[PDB]
Amino acid sequence: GSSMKISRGLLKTILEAAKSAHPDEFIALLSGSKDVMDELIFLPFVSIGMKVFGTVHSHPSPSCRPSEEDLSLFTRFGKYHIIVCYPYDENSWKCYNRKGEEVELEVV
Ligand SMILES: [Zn+2]
């Protein structure tokens, strides 16, 4: 398709990072080249061609839905924003646009 894409490898990395971070909220910037998210810009959440597609963060609760706070984060920068949630299984994730609307990510 012609929508944003994400590598299965990055999803695995993200979900494992979330599991490792639990119960804290893991957060990082989604990056890569062309039209595929396949790299991460790690951020201190614990107490050529490269581009920043947006952000990804985890929820320690079983909800992958965004809060009002998340919407304010999504609007600051980046086109895409992923939220992963407990139990962090293969399908425990959802992607949203800069406005908080759920959008697709083709897994490649
Ligand atoms: Zn959130």
Query: Which method resolved this structure?
Result: X-ray
Tokens of 10: 């990055």
Please name which of 94, 91, 88 lies closest in space to residue 65, comparing C-alpha atoms: 94
How much distance in Å is there from the Cα of 21 to the middle of ligand 1? 14
End-to-end C-alpha distance for the chain, whole angstroms? 11
Resolution (A): 1.5
Binding site membership for Zn(2+): which residues? 57, 59, 70
Token output for 66: 């965004």
Whether residue 57 contacts residue 25, with contact meaning beta carbons closer than 8 Å, is answered with yes
CA distance 4 to 68: 24
CATH code, domain carrying 74: 3.40.140.10
| Cα–Cα distances in angstroms (integers) from residue 23 to residues 4, 46, 60, in the given order | 29, 11, 5
For the purposes of burial, counting CB atoms within 10 Å of the CB of 25, is it exposed (0-12), middle (13-18) or buried (19 or more)?
middle
State the Cα–Cα distance between residues 48 and 18, nearest whole angstrom. 28
Could you tell me the distance, in angstroms and rounded to a whole number, from the CA of residue 69 to the centre of ligand 1?
A: 7
Quote the number of domains for the chain: 1
Three-state DSSP class for residue 99: coil
Q: What is the domain range of residue 87? A: 1-108
C-alpha span between 65 and 52 (Å, rounded): 22
How many angstroms separate the CA atoms of 32 and 38, rounded? 5
